[PDB]
Amino acid sequence: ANETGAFFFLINGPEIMSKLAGESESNLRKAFEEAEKNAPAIIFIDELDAIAPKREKTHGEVERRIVSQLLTLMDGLKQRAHVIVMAATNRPNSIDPALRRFGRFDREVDIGIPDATGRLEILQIHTKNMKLADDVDLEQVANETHGHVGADLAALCSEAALQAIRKKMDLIDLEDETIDAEVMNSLAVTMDDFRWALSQSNPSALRETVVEVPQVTWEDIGGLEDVKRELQELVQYPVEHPDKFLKFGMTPSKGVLFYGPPGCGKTLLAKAIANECQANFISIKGPELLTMWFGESEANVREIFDKARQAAPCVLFFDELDSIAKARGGNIGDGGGAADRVINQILTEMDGMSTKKNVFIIGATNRPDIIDPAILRPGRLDQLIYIPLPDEKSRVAILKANLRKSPVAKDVDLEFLAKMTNGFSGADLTEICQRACKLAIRESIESEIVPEIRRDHFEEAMRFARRSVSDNDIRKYEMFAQTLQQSRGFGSFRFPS
Amino acid sequence: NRPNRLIVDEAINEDNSVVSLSQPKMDELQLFRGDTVLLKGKKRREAVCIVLSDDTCSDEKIRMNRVVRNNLRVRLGDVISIQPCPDVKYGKRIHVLPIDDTVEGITGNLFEVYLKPYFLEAYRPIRKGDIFLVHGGMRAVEFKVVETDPSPYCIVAPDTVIHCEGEPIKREDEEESLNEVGYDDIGGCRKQLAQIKEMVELPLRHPALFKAIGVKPPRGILLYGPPGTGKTLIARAVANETGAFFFLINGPEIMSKLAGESESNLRKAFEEAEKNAPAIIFIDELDAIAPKREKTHGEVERRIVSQLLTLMDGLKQRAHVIVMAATNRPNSIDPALRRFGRFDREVDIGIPDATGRLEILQIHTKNMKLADDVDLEQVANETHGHVGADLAALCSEAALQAIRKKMDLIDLEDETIDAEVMNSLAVTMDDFRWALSQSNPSALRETVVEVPQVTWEDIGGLEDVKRELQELVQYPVEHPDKFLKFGMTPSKGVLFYGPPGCGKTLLAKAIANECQANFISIKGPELLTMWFGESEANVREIFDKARQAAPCVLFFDELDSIAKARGGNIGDGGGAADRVINQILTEMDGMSTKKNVFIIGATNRPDIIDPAILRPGRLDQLIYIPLPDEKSRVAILKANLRKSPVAKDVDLEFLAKMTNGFSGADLTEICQRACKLAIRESIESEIVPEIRRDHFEEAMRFARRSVSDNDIRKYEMFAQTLQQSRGFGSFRFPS
Numbered sequence A: 001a002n003e004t005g006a007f008f009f010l011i012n013g014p015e016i017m018s019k020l021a022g023e024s025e026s027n028l029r030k031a032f033e034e035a036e037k038n039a040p041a042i043i044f045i046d047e048l049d050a051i052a053p054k055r056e057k058t059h060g061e062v063e064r065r066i067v068s069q070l071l072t073l074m075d076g077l078k079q080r081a082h083v084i085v086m087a088a089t090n091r092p093n094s095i096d097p098a099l100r101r102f103g104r105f106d107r108e109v110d111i112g113i114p115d116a117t118g119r120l121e122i123l124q125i126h127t128k129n130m131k132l133a134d135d136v137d138l139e140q141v142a143n144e145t146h147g148h149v150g151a152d153l154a155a156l157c158s159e160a161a162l163q164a165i166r167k168k169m170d171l172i173d174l175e176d177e178t179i180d181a182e183v184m185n186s187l188a189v190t191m192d193d194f195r196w197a198l199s200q201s202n203p204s205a206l207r208e209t210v211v212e213v214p215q216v217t218w219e220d221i222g223g224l225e226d227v228k229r230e231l232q233e234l235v236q237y238p239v240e241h242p243d244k245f246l247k248f249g250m251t252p253s254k255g256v257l258f259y260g261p262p263g264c265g266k267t268l269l270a271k272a273i274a275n276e277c278q279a280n281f282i283s284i285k286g287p288e289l290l291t292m293w294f295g296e297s298e299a300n301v302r303e304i305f306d307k308a309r310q311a312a313p314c315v316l317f318f319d320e321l322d323s324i325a326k327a328r329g330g331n332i333g334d335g336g337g338a339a340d341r342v343i344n345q346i347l348t349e350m351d352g353m354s355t356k357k358n359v360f361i362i363g364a365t366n367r368p369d370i371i372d373p374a375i376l377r378p379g380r381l382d383q384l385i386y387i388p389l390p391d392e393k394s395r396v397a398i399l400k401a402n403l404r405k406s407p408v409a410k411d412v413d414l415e416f417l418a419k420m421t422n423g424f425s426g427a428d429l430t431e432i433c434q435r436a437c438k439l440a441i442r443e444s445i446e447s448e449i450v451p452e453i454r455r456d457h458f459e460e461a462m463r464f465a466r467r468s469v470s471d472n473d474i475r476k477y478e479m480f481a482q483t484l485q486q487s488r489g490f491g492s493f494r495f496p497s
Numbered sequence B: 001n002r003p004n005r006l007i008v009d010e011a012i013n014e015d016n017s018v019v020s021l022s023q024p025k026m027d028e029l030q031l032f033r034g035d036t037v038l039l040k041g042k043k044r045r046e047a048v049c050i051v052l053s054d055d056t057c058s059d060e061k062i063r064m065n066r067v068v069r070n071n072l073r074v075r076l077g078d079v080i081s082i083q084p085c086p087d088v089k090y091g092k093r094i095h096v097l098p099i100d101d102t103v104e105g106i107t108g109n110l111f112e113v114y115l116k117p118y119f120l121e122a123y124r125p126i127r128k129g130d131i132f133l134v135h136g137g138m139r140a141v142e143f144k145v146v147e148t149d150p151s152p153y154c155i156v157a158p159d160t161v162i163h164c165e166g167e168p169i170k171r172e173d174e175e176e177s178l179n180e181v182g183y184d185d186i187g188g189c190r191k192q193l194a195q196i197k198e199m200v201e202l203p204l205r206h207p208a209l210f211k212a213i214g215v216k217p218p219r220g221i222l223l224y225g226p227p228g229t230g231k232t233l234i235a236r237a238v239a240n241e242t243g244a245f246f247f248l249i250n251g252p253e254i255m256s257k258l259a260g261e262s263e264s265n266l267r268k269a270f271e272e273a274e275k276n277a278p279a280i281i282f283i284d285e286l287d288a289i290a291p292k293r294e295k296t297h298g299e300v301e302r303r304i305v306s307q308l309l310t311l312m313d314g315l316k317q318r319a320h321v322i323v324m325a326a327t328n329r330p331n332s333i334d335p336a337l338r339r340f341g342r343f344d345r346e347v348d349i350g351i352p353d354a355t356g357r358l359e360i361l362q363i364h365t366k367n368m369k370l371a372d373d374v375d376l377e378q379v380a381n382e383t384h385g386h387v388g389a390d391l392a393a394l395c396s397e398a399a400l401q402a403i404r405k406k407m408d409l410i411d412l413e414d415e416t417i418d419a420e421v422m423n424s425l426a427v428t429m430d431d432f433r434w435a436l437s438q439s440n441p442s443a444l445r446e447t448v449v450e451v452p453q454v455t456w457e458d459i460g461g462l463e464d465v466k467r468e469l470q471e472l473v474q475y476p477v478e479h480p481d482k483f484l485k486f487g488m489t490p491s492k493g494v495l496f497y498g499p500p501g502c503g504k505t506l507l508a509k510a511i512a513n514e515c516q517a518n519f520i521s522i523k524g525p526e527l528l529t530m531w532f533g534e535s536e537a538n539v540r541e542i543f544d545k546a547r548q549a550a551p552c553v554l555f556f557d558e559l560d561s562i563a564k565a566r567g568g569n570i571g572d573g574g575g576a577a578d579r580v581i582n583q584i585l586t587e588m589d590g591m592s593t594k595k596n597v598f599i600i601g602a603t604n605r606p607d608i609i610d611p612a613i614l615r616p617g618r619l620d621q622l623i624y625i626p627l628p629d630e631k632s633r634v635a636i637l638k639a640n641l642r643k644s645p646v647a648k649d650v651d652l653e654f655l656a657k658m659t660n661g662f663s664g665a666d667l668t669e670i671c672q673r674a675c676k677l678a679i680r681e682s683i684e685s686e687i688v689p690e691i692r693r694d695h696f697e698e699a700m701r702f703a704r705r706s707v708s709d710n711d712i713r714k715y716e717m718f719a720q721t722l723q724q725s726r727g728f729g730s731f732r733f734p735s
């Protein structure tokens, strides 16, 4: 509003209720009237969830009067002059549905927490006024923070400035009325201040939905070339060539569900597919899906699809989809079957969605024998992909992907190390590397009283090699995959004509 | 740049005006140890004090006492200058003249029994116009001389004489009443006050510095803790000693008046503070102001809440003001008040531990002198659930019992009371016992957040796990750069299992003391209280209180205790998850690993824990603690036998080797039974304070064996299955 030559008028949320009843509505009415005279103008409401809590409050005679006054003032906004009404809130469910009718708030926009590439920018956009040192960078400090609101970072910068100036103002002791500018500019900030400020900071949005752009590509996942082509030919073709799908007359697929042994990077391929297609990514993990099975609140699963469809294109990810069945039993469990208050909510919402929208649903699970057949019905989740244990040639790439960040010596051989594992999944290799690089630090610290790993740290690290995927689950998964595949009898046949 | 300035910091000594400096300062200005030093302050006045050498406080600072604080008109966070004065001073006469501001209700001679025992064996220089506090007679009174010999040349010596008149003078507004609360009047909380010291001292002592820069200072600080923790006193002290106006509105003074002007009073409270800049605003009770969670009643309640929100949303730069608020629980505050620019900064105050309650004892009982056999160290150990105000109330009530046992037989019925007998009202051991037994604690069921008092010497043996715990949680903190260089993250939690009764809490408590961090305790019964309560919001802030008091460690006891009430491996139609398992790991999934926090999981049966908890990323470290060996039980028994006297003929090596299926608790119960049976013989022989060998054979009769042979194999097969180091235990790489 300030850079369009239009008048800006701001009423936040409580300045209306602060005054006595009777004139609060008059102030709101005159706020709209004064803006019309200064056309073009704009109206912004900072807080509105405190204005119209018409869901569970049901108290106060003047509250509904103010809500109705606002509704009347905006229903009556004919052409006349040029004005735009802006409103801000915290959650979409904290707004009176009567305000969402056409002509009042028919257009909506959602703003999420920025990712690393966004928090990096918000760093300098606030710290530009202070010069930094030659060894202080904002790229690495923006990576540890993941749950900080955009205002959290600005507050962190301001607080770190105070710590930076405090360590010198005590020994300077410049007690005077006025202050010169020849010394206020030399108040540089160092590494010791951001660490303390970031450790002392208290994040605000830590449990909101994780809607960010991932930072992993196909190079981070080793092997698994069979599924890469299947995922590449399924979700990019309908977007890059929409006309070909419309010409034949059929609709593209809406979701892909895969199963396999736990610890095979079932989240990595779902995250990497978003980066190469230049789209957003959402994360609905198992614990995030068990939080409303007990909460008796089925309204929270309602807007997780709305926030995904608003940020089109996007992809929906579901982790350990059968994790709810473990708390309820399984194949038999209690007197019930394989459905509950949350299974019937997952598919009811995605049944009525438009396939034309640039959205995708990914279902990850470990045991496919517990999932109810209703989910796997043709039309919602028909694509089934089974990921087996990684081969010998794939584990080399898997290990070298994880060993990219840590320094690697020249005598480190990986081909022999990868071929000596048979019943080891993806997580078993990562934990071995973690143990080795942790044990390296112990020798470095003990020798202090070298920044390079050697071959001696390996033999002591493979001692703690764990084998989570036993032999009982391998056959159980193979018999299910073969039963669900069924390509026998007519695998090779030539048509006469 | 006149290299003589010194920063002002609060001292730690509880003596008279004695300053503390560092070791290079002694040779910087050629002073000796026992010399008289002169200090120069503002308002063109001098002072005299004594230098004390210290090497532990800091590298470059001074530690100046409360007397000369107000004597020299110097507040915390200011400049000061010091200089030697090797001049021989021999005082000859002094004028005594108290001020009637605090000398009320006290008659008789208060100059020959009150100031006399305090001046001897002190050798403290005095100056014309000094303000110092002294104790005696269940109260305290300051002193001020208006006309005496011209300073310097005043030293406390027996040859000096005294003379009194008996006409107090009227005080003026030039000085400040020292009877008010200072910074040293708060005890039991050192880490919490240091945060305020670096949060409030800058915007108040340096208004133009913040008015000239673009840094936005905090506009609101929220105070936590159970009622009576001392939230009001902290706010009163941080404002009275900064030269800033203090305005207090508690909680109900707004709702007491008729509707319509309550909002006007709140509005004018903010406006009057702006004129007296710099100023401060403190709200004693706010949970009663904005109960916008479940009340949903009252038309004017939301009006007052919105008025407060509007008044603090509109707080632009203009002048310098800090709004303080206090409450009882973080969940009793309107979330609309927690937005940025209103209460973005929060601080939590917990119940002090033994080392804190000890300090709060003398900080209140300093005004009464004690006996030679009455100590506050032992009496502060039995109390664990007492609020900081509980201890002050206990001291006041114990004073009443101490005076009652003599006032009946004295029977001094008169209008006025002399000070020659009110000072002789000493308190003995019989009064604290009765007062502590009759006292009613307030916070007994709050979260136990204190610093433990156990070290590695209290746990015998178990050297295998000591190195594993030492190389896991101290290395990332002491050497953060090494973990960042490799590019991987340190571990976030360690879960261990084993037979019950092996000190699964002792190693979790001892690891906090050697790392100088706080410790929290979430036991099994504390974890089963919300499985039935149907309230999942209480597990929400137990992590917030732990992360605010960084560094800290989270401890979980008998983690599978919930599964016992629901079954176990099979149980009901469900599996191994419920309304509380899914809340333990969901909150710790999204936490930042960079924070100095740790999670410890203790359990007895590891076959019942759901595999979701043990997933790589949340709790991946598994340690199995077996039964103690023969060489470890000797240390285990001697750790428990440290407090009780031990005879010279007591052999422990043979006593430890004769136990095979005995866990840690089985040895402690044997020692408890033996030392209890010792008291029976001592009492029976009364009609000796040393144990003998006869009390043992009668005590091992009641030896119990809780850990049977069925659980040992069950735990060993699980540990071996979860370890799996066979097949590739010894292999040499070719290259």
Ligand SMILES: Nc1ncnc2c1ncn2[C@@H]1O[C@H](COP(=O)(O)OP(=O)(O)O)[C@@H](O)[C@H]1O
Pocket (backbone or CB within 6 Å): A220, A221, A222, A223, A224, A261, A262, A263, A264, A265, A266, A267, A268, A364, A398, A401, A425, A426, A427, A430
């Ligand atoms: N092809 C692969 N490339 C890179 N990492 C892999 C691959 N397969 C498995 N991993 C590793 O396995 C780990 C487990 O990932 P996760 O998504 O939790 O598996 P799951 O699908 O069982 O959830 C990941 O951290 C990942 O590094």
Ligand SMILES: Nc1ncnc2c1ncn2[C@@H]1O[C@H](COP(=O)(O)OP(=O)(O)O)[C@@H](O)[C@H]1O
Pocket (backbone or CB within 6 Å): B185, B186, B187, B188, B189, B226, B227, B228, B229, B230, B231, B232, B233, B326, B360, B363, B388, B389, B392
């Ligand atoms: N930590 C403490 N240090 C010194 N005195 C204390 C402390 N805690 C309580 N007191 C004493 O007990 C009283 C507790 O009252 P106060 O803390 O002001 O109310 P609240 O506990 O609601 O903040 C104080 O007035 C003070 O005299």
Ligand SMILES: Nc1ncnc2c1ncn2[C@@H]1O[C@H](COP(=O)(O)OP(=O)(O)O)[C@@H](O)[C@H]1O
Pocket (backbone or CB within 6 Å): B458, B459, B460, B461, B462, B499, B500, B501, B502, B503, B504, B505, B506, B602, B636, B639, B664, B665, B668
């Ligand atoms: N190594 C040890 N050193 C000292 N005490 C021990 C040791 N092992 C066990 N104990 C004793 O066992 C008792 C039980 O401790 P506790 O933490 O309750 O065991 P658990 O881990 O089974 O809960 C403690 O009071 C402690 O004195």
